[PDB]
Amino acid sequence: GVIDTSAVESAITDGQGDMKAIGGYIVGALVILAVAGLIYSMLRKA
Amino acid sequence: GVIDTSAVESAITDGQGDMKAIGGYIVGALVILAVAGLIYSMLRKA
Amino acid sequence: GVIDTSAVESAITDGQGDMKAIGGYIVGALVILAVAGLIYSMLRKA
Amino acid sequence: GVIDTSAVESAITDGQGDMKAIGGYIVGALVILAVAGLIYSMLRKA
Amino acid sequence: GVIDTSAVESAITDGQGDMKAIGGYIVGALVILAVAGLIYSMLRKA
Amino acid sequence: GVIDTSAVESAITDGQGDMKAIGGYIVGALVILAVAGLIYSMLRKA
Amino acid sequence: GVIDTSAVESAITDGQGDMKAIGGYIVGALVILAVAGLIYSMLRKA
Amino acid sequence: GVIDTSAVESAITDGQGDMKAIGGYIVGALVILAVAGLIYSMLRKA
Amino acid sequence: GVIDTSAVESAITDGQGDMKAIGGYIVGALVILAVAGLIYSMLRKA
Amino acid sequence: GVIDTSAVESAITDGQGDMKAIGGYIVGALVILAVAGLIYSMLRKA
Amino acid sequence: GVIDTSAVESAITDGQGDMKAIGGYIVGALVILAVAGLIYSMLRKA
Amino acid sequence: GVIDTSAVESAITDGQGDMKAIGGYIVGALVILAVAGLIYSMLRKA
Amino acid sequence: GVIDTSAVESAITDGQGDMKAIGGYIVGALVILAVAGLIYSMLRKA
Amino acid sequence: GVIDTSAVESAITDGQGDMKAIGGYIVGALVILAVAGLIYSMLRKA
Amino acid sequence: GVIDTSAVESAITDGQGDMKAIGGYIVGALVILAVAGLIYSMLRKA
Amino acid sequence: GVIDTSAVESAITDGQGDMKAIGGYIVGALVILAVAGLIYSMLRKA
Amino acid sequence: GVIDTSAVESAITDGQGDMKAIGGYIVGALVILAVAGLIYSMLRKA
Amino acid sequence: GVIDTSAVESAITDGQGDMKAIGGYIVGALVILAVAGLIYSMLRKA
Amino acid sequence: GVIDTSAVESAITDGQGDMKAIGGYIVGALVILAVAGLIYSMLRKA
Amino acid sequence: GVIDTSAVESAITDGQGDMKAIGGYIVGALVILAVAGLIYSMLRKA
Amino acid sequence: GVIDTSAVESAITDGQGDMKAIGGYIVGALVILAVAGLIYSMLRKA
Amino acid sequence: GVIDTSAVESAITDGQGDMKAIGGYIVGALVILAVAGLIYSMLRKA
Amino acid sequence: GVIDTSAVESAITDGQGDMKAIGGYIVGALVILAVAGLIYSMLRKA
Amino acid sequence: GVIDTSAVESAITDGQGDMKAIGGYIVGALVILAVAGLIYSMLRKA
Amino acid sequence: GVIDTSAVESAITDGQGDMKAIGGYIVGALVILAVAGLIYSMLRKA
Amino acid sequence: GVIDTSAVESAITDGQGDMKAIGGYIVGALVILAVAGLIYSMLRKA
Amino acid sequence: GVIDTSAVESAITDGQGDMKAIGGYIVGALVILAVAGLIYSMLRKA
Amino acid sequence: GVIDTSAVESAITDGQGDMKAIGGYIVGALVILAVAGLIYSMLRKA
Amino acid sequence: GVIDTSAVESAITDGQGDMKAIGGYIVGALVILAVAGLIYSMLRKA
Amino acid sequence: GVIDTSAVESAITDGQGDMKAIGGYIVGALVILAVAGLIYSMLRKA
Amino acid sequence: GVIDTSAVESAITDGQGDMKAIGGYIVGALVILAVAGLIYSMLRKA
Amino acid sequence: GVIDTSAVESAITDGQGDMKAIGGYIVGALVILAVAGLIYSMLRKA
Amino acid sequence: GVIDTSAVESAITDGQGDMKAIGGYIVGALVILAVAGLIYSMLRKA
Amino acid sequence: GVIDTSAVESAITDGQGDMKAIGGYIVGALVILAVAGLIYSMLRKA
Amino acid sequence: GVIDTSAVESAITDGQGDMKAIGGYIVGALVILAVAGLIYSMLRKA
């Protein structure tokens, strides 16, 4: 008997690996929103 | 007479054993989702 | 005359005996599924 | 006959146990959001 | 003639008996989800 | 038959219990904002 | 012939019975959210 | 001549008799599943 | 010759009869879910 | 055949019934906000 | 030969019939939400 | 010579005759399942 | 088939109806502010 | 020799014939679900 | 073979039809808000 | 259906009611300023 | 639709009405100053 | 498809219509201030 | 069936109750501003 | 030998054919939602 | 295969079309505010 | 796309137009003051 | 509902009260100027 | 063996293709909102 | 001796052959579902 | 349920408390202006 | 992939374009105020 | 003896092979959704 | 069961703590404005 | 006598042997599903 | 195994790319507001 | 990332540039007042 | 059995960790707004 | 695991960086106002 | 947890720091006005 669930350990890892990519790159675009909003509020201020 | 259902006791155990692997490693990827979502909500916040 | 169906009484009993094994050990693996699913749903929740 | 659903009682308990972890630690991050938002509103105020 | 389906009456009863266990204990973990979600929504609220 | 949804009655109650905490303590910080704003307006006034 | 689906009539009723509990107690916690939000908006108002 | 198939009429009747037992008691356990599922869905709902 | 499949006509009818019971009573519990959900959404609304 | 969806007609009605309660009583608190704001603006005016 | 699937034509029709009930009455409660929300927004407006 | 297999022609016909009964009446109970399932899905829907 | 969205036509109308109330009565209080401000400026003038 | 499997050609055809009935009428009830869901989403929208 | 998805073409159309109703009538109430807000701002202006 | 926006009609009225108070009493103090200024100018005159 | 800005037409009119009062009565006191100044200059003259 | 934003064209127009009222009548009261101020300055002059 | 939205009637009432507190006490501080401003203008006057 | 799975090629094609209908017509109703939402947001905007 | 998202191209266009209406007509009312404010400031000036 | 800010060009122009009116007519009254003051000083002179 | 604008009635009164003080005491110093000026003119006279 | 998932490669591509349409055209309507809002803020400004 | 299981080799092959047909054509209809779902989610998105 | 808006009663009170400070001390500096102006006018007088 | 945010570049430009219009024409009316004020001060001067 | 499960090793591999296709191409369409949503949120932002 | 909302009690407290900082230090800068304005008015006075 | 069931021991072993192949390789394709689903959920998330 | 989330890296980048466009061009219009406001305040000044 | 706030540096500069214009030209008119006042005082002198 | 939700404890912590970063750095930019606003108000003051 | 919120640290910094630009350059224009106002007051003085 | 509002303490301080600059330097120019006015009054005196 057996069952090599070793290709899982690996394969799942890539899964996390890509979500860090999506997870990071995603944020990169929320900063543009962010800062562009501080500035927008600086100008309308004075 | 007899019937050695001892290879079961064992063999099934591996079954659980691998599901803890899938069961754990699976969660590892739900945290990436999770945290990447707190941060996403921190940035859009302020 | 006669017919010793006593080796049956016994032999069948083992039959039940092993099915409790399969029957129990089997469930042991449905809990791993179970709990690993509550947790999976806790994380995706918040 | 029988069926030892005692490994369930236990195993499920851990399930709750971990969800209190996820459940608590999760909130720990909603306070950071929270307070960081009161302050954000104090500054923009005056 | 006969057929003692009395060991059934009993044996099935345990079946229900254990499902109340699984049935209850299962819910115990859906409350943790539940409440942890009210609170999560209280904090993000104000 | 049965289903002890008594652990709910309780468990949910804590849920409300904590939201009164969050609910109160939250307000404690909206007063600081509040008063600090009356005063801010008193000074700029005269 | 027959089939006593009378234990259903009953057993299902409890089902509704408990959902009124969950159904009510659940709402009890949405009011805390609610009111705590009117007040939160009263203070930030003036 | 003859053939007393009267012990059949009877003996078969018990057969039905026991299947009503199995048939009923069996259902008793499908309600536990049932209700425990309505409640499970009430909690996850709100 | 013959074959009195008249006990079927009847016996099956009860079958439908009970499924209307299960079929109705079942729905009775989906309304509790339903309404308890409209209200839940009314409160969180305003 | 049949299916008494009459307990729905009723049960849903209560649903609306309670939302008028929440719906009305909710507004009662938006007037306090409202008027308390006209007055707040009368005083700061002159 | 044959197969009277005429009791279907009918029986299914009731099925639609009741879903128009649920389908309509359901909406009746989404208007209460709706309007109660326009008004809620009128008051907080001025 | 001969062999009157005419009592067959007939006798078999009844066989079909009863299976249309079982065959129809059987379906009558699959509609109850059916419709009771559309409705069940209408309610949980909205 | 169908769907009586006629209770909407009506129900929404009341919605507008009440907002004219809030909408009008609201203004009634902005005139008091208004005039009380012309007069306030007449007196401080001479 | 022979074997008139002509009563099949026919008899099976009815089989398809009725499944178009069940197949169509069945869908008639999935539209009610469908549309009643677009509308449900229109109202909750604005 | 076949499948009359013609009752769909129609039935869906009504779906759109009603959403134009909800869609229009809904807006009718956003104008009341709108105009009542221009006027509110005219008065507080001078 | 309904929505008793009658508690508004009333409640808003008080709003105006109090602003007449603030509105009047406010002026009472602008006369003191006023007259005290005519006199101040009479004396410095001759 | 509508918006009765008729209570304005009126209410504003009173506004003018009172300013004629303040406007007139105010002048009444500038004549006393005036004449009392001609006389003051007549006496100091000769 | 469609969307009758014709009730807007109209409804908004009234909005302007009333603001001309407020806009005009408002000025009517700034003239009283105005003239009453020329005269006030004529008298104090000589 | 049922749904005790009676704990709402009450709970919401407190909501209004506290907003009268915030609503009143808030004004208490706008008078200090107010009067302190009349006096400030009396002194700078003469 | 053989097996004319040619009536499949065809019959399945209709299957796709109807899903394009459902698939298209379905979208027709998501645009009404869509646009009616842009407009809803235009009005509440200014 | 296919998917006629051509009814979108169109339908969305109307969406823009109406927002130009709301968008323009909306401004028409901000000019009345505007000019009525220049004049208001001309009069109070001299 | 577009935005007809042409009704502005016009509407604003009237704004200037009326301020020339107020602007001129206003001066007409400062001459009366003026000349009436030269004469007042001629008489008191000799 | 309510709003105790009674603390205003009072609080404003003090406002007038103090302005009579400032208003009177202020004049006390304009007499010293006054008389000291009659005398100054008596002496330089003869 | 085989499986021509080539009709996927294609068919999915159209999927993206249409979402660029919806994706673009959608934005076209967010600019109208956008600009119409800059202008709205220019006018109310001066 | 012998046994020509050569008509099998062939005949089975057709079996696979047709399942590739069913297997492919089947998928063709899961893409329509698929894409029609991406688009459905694009529209409801913005 | 509850909501201790008692920390408000207090906290707001301090708010008034400090504004009396600012409110008083502020005036202390308007007297210096005041008197220093009577004297300035006494000296330039004679 | 793609996303033609080119209709933005353009559309926004018009936005600026119109604000220069409002921005300029607006000033045209502040000069009338301006000059009409120099002259007003020249006349009252001598 | 034997059993060439080698055509499996291969055949299954294609299975994975195609799911990477579906798996990838599928994502290609979730990015369009994604980005088109960042942009949608950038525009509505400022 | 449980939920340690104790890290909230604390964490929120810091929130208030920092707002007292911002709240105080903020005022420190409104005094500079204040006093620098009394003096500015003393000098321009005499 | 005898019976060499030794070719079984062996032959069956291969049976298990191949099922590990099918058993493993099968899973290899459930991971592709799995991961491709985490990622699908990451993208739609933010 | 694999999953080419490389088309993401790219595709998301464009997302940021366009938001810099919207982000910049957006600001271009807040300066027009800005400067047009300094000038507006220069003119009304002197 | 980035944000070209370079169009600001420039655009603001023009802002100052025009205020020097308004700032200078404005003064040009205060000299006319000035000198015309020295002369006015020379003539009335002797 | 088991389930190592230890990688959560950790992973979530980073989540908070980064939100303190976003949470702090975010505020750093609200001070620039803040102070730049005190100064802006100092200059326009005198 | 991880999440590189390092592109934030940076990106936000630029945000502050640009607000110092807007923040400074903005003030540059409040001085022109300022000084141009001292001078304006010097000339009108003598 | 935490929140370093230490960069505030500092940053705000500079805010005061610069206002002392503006606050002082501003006065420097009110003395020039002042003295230049004493002298102006000395000369016109004798």
Side-chain angles (χ1 to χ4, degrees), chain X residues 2-3 5-7 10 13 15 18-19 22 27-28 30 33 35-43 45:
Chain X
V2 75
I3 259 177
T5 295
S6 322
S10 59
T13 296
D18 286 321
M19 288 140 41
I22 300 136
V27 156
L30 271 86
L33 273 278
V35 169
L38 290 169
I39 288 168
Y40 143 33
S41 287
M42 181 57 142
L43 282 162
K45 181 195 197 112

PDB file of all heavy atoms in Angstrom, chain X residues 2-3 5-7 10 13 15 18-19 22 27-28 30 33 35-43 45:
ATOM      1  N   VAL X   2      -7.867  11.105 -26.613  1.00  0.00           N
ATOM      2  CA  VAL X   2      -7.767  12.573 -26.882  1.00  0.00           C
ATOM      3  C   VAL X   2      -8.861  13.332 -26.114  1.00  0.00           C
ATOM      4  O   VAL X   2      -9.510  12.766 -25.231  1.00  0.00           O
ATOM      5  CB  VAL X   2      -7.893  12.933 -28.429  1.00  0.00           C
ATOM      6  CG1 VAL X   2      -9.357  12.823 -28.927  1.00  0.00           C
ATOM      7  CG2 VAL X   2      -7.294  14.332 -28.724  1.00  0.00           C
ATOM      8  N   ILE X   3      -8.978  14.630 -26.406  1.00  0.00           N
ATOM      9  CA  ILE X   3      -9.986  15.541 -25.844  1.00  0.00           C
ATOM     10  C   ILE X   3      -9.618  16.941 -26.348  1.00  0.00           C
ATOM     11  O   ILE X   3      -8.669  17.565 -25.861  1.00  0.00           O
ATOM     12  CB  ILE X   3     -10.095  15.454 -24.273  1.00  0.00           C
ATOM     13  CG1 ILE X   3     -11.318  14.611 -23.892  1.00  0.00           C
ATOM     14  CG2 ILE X   3     -10.268  16.823 -23.655  1.00  0.00           C
ATOM     15  CD1 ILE X   3     -11.488  14.385 -22.410  1.00  0.00           C
ATOM     16  N   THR X   5      -9.782  20.310 -26.343  1.00  0.00           N
ATOM     17  CA  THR X   5     -10.096  21.456 -25.530  1.00  0.00           C
ATOM     18  C   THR X   5      -9.509  22.645 -26.280  1.00  0.00           C
ATOM     19  O   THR X   5      -8.787  23.470 -25.734  1.00  0.00           O
ATOM     20  CB  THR X   5      -9.510  21.229 -24.141  1.00  0.00           C
ATOM     21  OG1 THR X   5     -10.184  20.102 -23.555  1.00  0.00           O
ATOM     22  CG2 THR X   5      -9.689  22.435 -23.239  1.00  0.00           C
ATOM     23  N   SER X   6      -9.776  22.678 -27.576  1.00  0.00           N
ATOM     24  CA  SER X   6      -9.299  23.753 -28.436  1.00  0.00           C
ATOM     25  C   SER X   6     -10.446  24.734 -28.610  1.00  0.00           C
ATOM     26  O   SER X   6     -10.226  25.934 -28.786  1.00  0.00           O
ATOM     27  CB  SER X   6      -8.875  23.209 -29.808  1.00  0.00           C
ATOM     28  OG  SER X   6      -8.225  21.944 -29.687  1.00  0.00           O
ATOM     29  N   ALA X   7     -11.672  24.227 -28.544  1.00  0.00           N
ATOM     30  CA  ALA X   7     -12.859  25.066 -28.673  1.00  0.00           C
ATOM     31  C   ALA X   7     -13.011  25.918 -27.410  1.00  0.00           C
ATOM     32  O   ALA X   7     -13.815  26.851 -27.359  1.00  0.00           O
ATOM     33  CB  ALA X   7     -14.083  24.198 -28.907  1.00  0.00           C
ATOM     34  N   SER X  10     -10.380  29.139 -27.745  1.00  0.00           N
ATOM     35  CA  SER X  10     -11.134  30.108 -28.507  1.00  0.00           C
ATOM     36  C   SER X  10     -12.250  30.710 -27.670  1.00  0.00           C
ATOM     37  O   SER X  10     -12.097  31.804 -27.162  1.00  0.00           O
ATOM     38  CB  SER X  10     -11.713  29.470 -29.791  1.00  0.00           C
ATOM     39  OG  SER X  10     -12.563  28.371 -29.534  1.00  0.00           O
ATOM     40  N   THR X  13     -11.554  33.113 -25.014  1.00  0.00           N
ATOM     41  CA  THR X  13     -11.011  34.332 -25.554  1.00  0.00           C
ATOM     42  C   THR X  13     -12.136  35.329 -25.819  1.00  0.00           C
ATOM     43  O   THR X  13     -12.039  36.487 -25.417  1.00  0.00           O
ATOM     44  CB  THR X  13     -10.202  34.023 -26.835  1.00  0.00           C
ATOM     45  OG1 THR X  13      -9.073  33.199 -26.500  1.00  0.00           O
ATOM     46  CG2 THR X  13      -9.703  35.290 -27.495  1.00  0.00           C
ATOM     47  N   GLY X  15     -14.772  35.477 -24.355  1.00  0.00           N
ATOM     48  CA  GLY X  15     -15.199  35.855 -23.023  1.00  0.00           C
ATOM     49  C   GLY X  15     -14.485  37.070 -22.524  1.00  0.00           C
ATOM     50  O   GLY X  15     -15.102  37.943 -21.943  1.00  0.00           O
ATOM     51  N   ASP X  18     -15.368  40.207 -24.707  1.00  0.00           N
ATOM     52  CA  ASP X  18     -16.565  40.956 -24.358  1.00  0.00           C
ATOM     53  C   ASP X  18     -16.449  41.747 -23.074  1.00  0.00           C
ATOM     54  O   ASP X  18     -17.136  42.758 -22.904  1.00  0.00           O
ATOM     55  CB  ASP X  18     -17.768  40.041 -24.250  1.00  0.00           C
ATOM     56  CG  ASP X  18     -18.260  39.583 -25.590  1.00  0.00           C
ATOM     57  OD1 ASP X  18     -18.259  40.409 -26.538  1.00  0.00           O
ATOM     58  OD2 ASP X  18     -18.647  38.393 -25.695  1.00  0.00           O
ATOM     59  N   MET X  19     -15.625  41.258 -22.152  1.00  0.00           N
ATOM     60  CA  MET X  19     -15.425  41.906 -20.858  1.00  0.00           C
ATOM     61  C   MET X  19     -14.569  43.173 -21.033  1.00  0.00           C
ATOM     62  O   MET X  19     -14.539  44.050 -20.178  1.00  0.00           O
ATOM     63  CB  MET X  19     -14.809  40.910 -19.833  1.00  0.00           C
ATOM     64  CG  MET X  19     -15.770  39.760 -19.291  1.00  0.00           C
ATOM     65  SD  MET X  19     -15.098  38.026 -19.043  1.00  0.00           S
ATOM     66  CE  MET X  19     -13.648  38.419 -18.396  1.00  0.00           C
ATOM     67  N   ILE X  22     -17.443  45.498 -22.061  1.00  0.00           N
ATOM     68  CA  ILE X  22     -18.165  45.898 -20.886  1.00  0.00           C
ATOM     69  C   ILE X  22     -17.195  46.727 -20.042  1.00  0.00           C
ATOM     70  O   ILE X  22     -17.490  47.861 -19.695  1.00  0.00           O
ATOM     71  CB  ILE X  22     -18.682  44.646 -20.167  1.00  0.00           C
ATOM     72  CG1 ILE X  22     -19.595  43.900 -21.148  1.00  0.00           C
ATOM     73  CG2 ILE X  22     -19.469  45.011 -18.933  1.00  0.00           C
ATOM     74  CD1 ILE X  22     -19.396  42.428 -21.212  1.00  0.00           C
ATOM     75  N   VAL X  27     -16.513  52.256 -18.071  1.00  0.00           N
ATOM     76  CA  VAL X  27     -15.715  53.399 -17.651  1.00  0.00           C
ATOM     77  C   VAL X  27     -16.154  54.675 -18.327  1.00  0.00           C
ATOM     78  O   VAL X  27     -16.150  55.740 -17.716  1.00  0.00           O
ATOM     79  CB  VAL X  27     -14.200  53.164 -17.910  1.00  0.00           C
ATOM     80  CG1 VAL X  27     -13.446  54.499 -18.040  1.00  0.00           C
ATOM     81  CG2 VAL X  27     -13.600  52.323 -16.762  1.00  0.00           C
ATOM     82  N   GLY X  28     -16.571  54.558 -19.581  1.00  0.00           N
ATOM     83  CA  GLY X  28     -17.013  55.720 -20.325  1.00  0.00           C
ATOM     84  C   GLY X  28     -18.055  56.486 -19.555  1.00  0.00           C
ATOM     85  O   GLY X  28     -18.134  57.712 -19.630  1.00  0.00           O
ATOM     86  N   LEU X  30     -18.209  56.482 -16.190  1.00  0.00           N
ATOM     87  CA  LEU X  30     -17.704  56.944 -14.902  1.00  0.00           C
ATOM     88  C   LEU X  30     -16.969  58.269 -15.041  1.00  0.00           C
ATOM     89  O   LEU X  30     -16.722  58.951 -14.051  1.00  0.00           O
ATOM     90  CB  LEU X  30     -16.855  55.870 -14.177  1.00  0.00           C
ATOM     91  CG  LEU X  30     -17.642  54.901 -13.251  1.00  0.00           C
ATOM     92  CD1 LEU X  30     -18.165  53.759 -14.048  1.00  0.00           C
ATOM     93  CD2 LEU X  30     -16.825  54.358 -12.087  1.00  0.00           C
ATOM     94  N   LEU X  33     -19.660  61.011 -14.919  1.00  0.00           N
ATOM     95  CA  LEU X  33     -19.873  61.256 -13.504  1.00  0.00           C
ATOM     96  C   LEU X  33     -18.750  62.168 -13.073  1.00  0.00           C
ATOM     97  O   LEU X  33     -18.987  63.286 -12.613  1.00  0.00           O
ATOM     98  CB  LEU X  33     -19.722  59.962 -12.697  1.00  0.00           C
ATOM     99  CG  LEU X  33     -20.820  58.932 -12.414  1.00  0.00           C
ATOM    100  CD1 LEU X  33     -21.698  59.348 -11.247  1.00  0.00           C
ATOM    101  CD2 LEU X  33     -21.652  58.701 -13.647  1.00  0.00           C
ATOM    102  N   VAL X  35     -16.204  64.207 -14.495  1.00  0.00           N
ATOM    103  CA  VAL X  35     -16.138  65.592 -14.979  1.00  0.00           C
ATOM    104  C   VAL X  35     -17.333  66.419 -14.544  1.00  0.00           C
ATOM    105  O   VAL X  35     -17.192  67.559 -14.085  1.00  0.00           O
ATOM    106  CB  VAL X  35     -15.969  65.656 -16.532  1.00  0.00           C
ATOM    107  CG1 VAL X  35     -16.182  67.077 -17.045  1.00  0.00           C
ATOM    108  CG2 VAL X  35     -14.567  65.188 -16.928  1.00  0.00           C
ATOM    109  N   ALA X  36     -18.514  65.845 -14.670  1.00  0.00           N
ATOM    110  CA  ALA X  36     -19.701  66.549 -14.260  1.00  0.00           C
ATOM    111  C   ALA X  36     -19.595  66.907 -12.770  1.00  0.00           C
ATOM    112  O   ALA X  36     -20.317  67.764 -12.273  1.00  0.00           O
ATOM    113  CB  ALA X  36     -20.922  65.694 -14.537  1.00  0.00           C
ATOM    114  N   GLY X  37     -18.652  66.288 -12.074  1.00  0.00           N
ATOM    115  CA  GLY X  37     -18.463  66.570 -10.668  1.00  0.00           C
ATOM    116  C   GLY X  37     -17.417  67.626 -10.384  1.00  0.00           C
ATOM    117  O   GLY X  37     -17.409  68.233  -9.323  1.00  0.00           O
ATOM    118  N   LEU X  38     -16.520  67.846 -11.334  1.00  0.00           N
ATOM    119  CA  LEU X  38     -15.463  68.831 -11.176  1.00  0.00           C
ATOM    120  C   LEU X  38     -16.114  70.142 -11.418  1.00  0.00           C
ATOM    121  O   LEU X  38     -15.965  71.074 -10.635  1.00  0.00           O
ATOM    122  CB  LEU X  38     -14.388  68.603 -12.204  1.00  0.00           C
ATOM    123  CG  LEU X  38     -13.635  67.322 -11.884  1.00  0.00           C
ATOM    124  CD1 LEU X  38     -12.742  66.967 -13.065  1.00  0.00           C
ATOM    125  CD2 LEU X  38     -12.879  67.491 -10.569  1.00  0.00           C
ATOM    126  N   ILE X  39     -16.885  70.171 -12.494  1.00  0.00           N
ATOM    127  CA  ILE X  39     -17.629  71.343 -12.872  1.00  0.00           C
ATOM    128  C   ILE X  39     -18.617  71.674 -11.784  1.00  0.00           C
ATOM    129  O   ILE X  39     -18.712  72.824 -11.383  1.00  0.00           O
ATOM    130  CB  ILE X  39     -18.361  71.148 -14.197  1.00  0.00           C
ATOM    131  CG1 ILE X  39     -17.343  71.153 -15.338  1.00  0.00           C
ATOM    132  CG2 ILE X  39     -19.431  72.229 -14.373  1.00  0.00           C
ATOM    133  CD1 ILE X  39     -17.894  70.700 -16.634  1.00  0.00           C
ATOM    134  N   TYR X  40     -19.379  70.691 -11.322  1.00  0.00           N
ATOM    135  CA  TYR X  40     -20.319  70.983 -10.248  1.00  0.00           C
ATOM    136  C   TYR X  40     -19.529  71.699  -9.113  1.00  0.00           C
ATOM    137  O   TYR X  40     -19.973  72.733  -8.600  1.00  0.00           O
ATOM    138  CB  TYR X  40     -21.047  69.708  -9.803  1.00  0.00           C
ATOM    139  CG  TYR X  40     -21.337  69.572  -8.315  1.00  0.00           C
ATOM    140  CD1 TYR X  40     -21.620  70.687  -7.529  1.00  0.00           C
ATOM    141  CD2 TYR X  40     -21.363  68.326  -7.702  1.00  0.00           C
ATOM    142  CE1 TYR X  40     -21.905  70.598  -6.164  1.00  0.00           C
ATOM    143  CE2 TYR X  40     -21.626  68.211  -6.315  1.00  0.00           C
ATOM    144  CZ  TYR X  40     -21.913  69.366  -5.565  1.00  0.00           C
ATOM    145  OH  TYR X  40     -22.195  69.353  -4.209  1.00  0.00           O
ATOM    146  N   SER X  41     -18.323  71.232  -8.803  1.00  0.00           N
ATOM    147  CA  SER X  41     -17.555  71.862  -7.725  1.00  0.00           C
ATOM    148  C   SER X  41     -16.902  73.198  -8.090  1.00  0.00           C
ATOM    149  O   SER X  41     -16.559  73.993  -7.216  1.00  0.00           O
ATOM    150  CB  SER X  41     -16.556  70.885  -7.107  1.00  0.00           C
ATOM    151  OG  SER X  41     -17.246  69.923  -6.304  1.00  0.00           O
ATOM    152  N   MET X  42     -16.743  73.474  -9.378  1.00  0.00           N
ATOM    153  CA  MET X  42     -16.190  74.751  -9.795  1.00  0.00           C
ATOM    154  C   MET X  42     -17.263  75.831  -9.542  1.00  0.00           C
ATOM    155  O   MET X  42     -17.031  76.833  -8.854  1.00  0.00           O
ATOM    156  CB  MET X  42     -15.816  74.724 -11.279  1.00  0.00           C
ATOM    157  CG  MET X  42     -15.214  76.010 -11.778  1.00  0.00           C
ATOM    158  SD  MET X  42     -13.760  76.424 -10.787  1.00  0.00           S
ATOM    159  CE  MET X  42     -12.685  77.090 -12.009  1.00  0.00           C
ATOM    160  N   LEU X  43     -18.465  75.594 -10.045  1.00  0.00           N
ATOM    161  CA  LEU X  43     -19.543  76.542  -9.882  1.00  0.00           C
ATOM    162  C   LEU X  43     -19.854  76.854  -8.428  1.00  0.00           C
ATOM    163  O   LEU X  43     -19.942  78.010  -8.056  1.00  0.00           O
ATOM    164  CB  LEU X  43     -20.813  76.038 -10.562  1.00  0.00           C
ATOM    165  CG  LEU X  43     -20.842  76.215 -12.075  1.00  0.00           C
ATOM    166  CD1 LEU X  43     -21.884  75.344 -12.756  1.00  0.00           C
ATOM    167  CD2 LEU X  43     -21.106  77.663 -12.339  1.00  0.00           C
ATOM    168  N   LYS X  45     -18.095  76.739  -6.060  1.00  0.00           N
ATOM    169  CA  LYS X  45     -16.908  77.349  -5.487  1.00  0.00           C
ATOM    170  C   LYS X  45     -16.927  78.869  -5.462  1.00  0.00           C
ATOM    171  O   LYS X  45     -16.759  79.481  -4.398  1.00  0.00           O
ATOM    172  CB  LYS X  45     -15.677  76.896  -6.252  1.00  0.00           C
ATOM    173  CG  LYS X  45     -14.425  77.462  -5.696  1.00  0.00           C
ATOM    174  CD  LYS X  45     -13.277  77.313  -6.649  1.00  0.00           C
ATOM    175  CE  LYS X  45     -11.971  77.516  -5.895  1.00  0.00           C
ATOM    176  NZ  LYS X  45     -11.178  76.243  -5.796  1.00  0.00           N
TER     177      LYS X  45
END
